Design a protein around this ligand. Sequence first.
Ligand SMILES: Cc1nn(C)cc1C(=O)Nc1nc2ccccc2[nH]1
Length: 215
Amino acid sequence: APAAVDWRARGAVTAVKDQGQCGSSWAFSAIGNVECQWFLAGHPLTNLSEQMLVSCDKTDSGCSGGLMNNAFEWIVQENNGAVYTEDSYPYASGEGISPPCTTSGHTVGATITGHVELPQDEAQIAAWLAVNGPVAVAVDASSWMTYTGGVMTSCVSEQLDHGVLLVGYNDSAAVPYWIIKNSWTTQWGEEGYIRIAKGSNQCLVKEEASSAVVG
Ligand SMILES: Cc1nn(C)cc1C(=O)Nc1nc2ccccc2[nH]1
């Protein structure tokens, strides 16, 4: 794998979003992954619908949590790989209560055919990320509410509770870091992003790494 990758620079990552008071980071992690993969497959960068997942993926628990891998399985097995646009299935869960599932009225903006799980190895994850793009990972975000900037070096790494998106890394820096897209608006962290140290399993970043497959 190359020394440093940033898929934001390649135009592969959509704007930072806001999950609100909903426990739907799993859906932002999953949708954000799909968005990137969709683009990297030659299709236009498209905003896709977390609310689609929150309302309809009954394999997960809407505003009360879920798993990226479930979402990936749900999209393929229950929705024919279909992922609707953000515009046509906009987010309505900011106050923590999701509207129920709807089918009509939404426009299919992307398709996936499955997913892969990555090993619990940061070198291997970086290897995959270098070739195939942004990875969906679960982390411990307990120590994240007070992050301002810089590279988090001793993140509380005790229990996974939050889904995010690895959009890149940098092994050349003084403290090697992952670049992570979060869903807590752009006011948080570094314009909605956080850099955590790479190699010491900060926040348990490597425990649940996976990615949708497009085409
Ligand atoms: C369960 C679960 N598993 N995974 C991978 C993520 C979750 C989850 O509920 N995350 C989540 N809830 C939040 C509530 C408020 C702000 C941010 C929040 N993030």
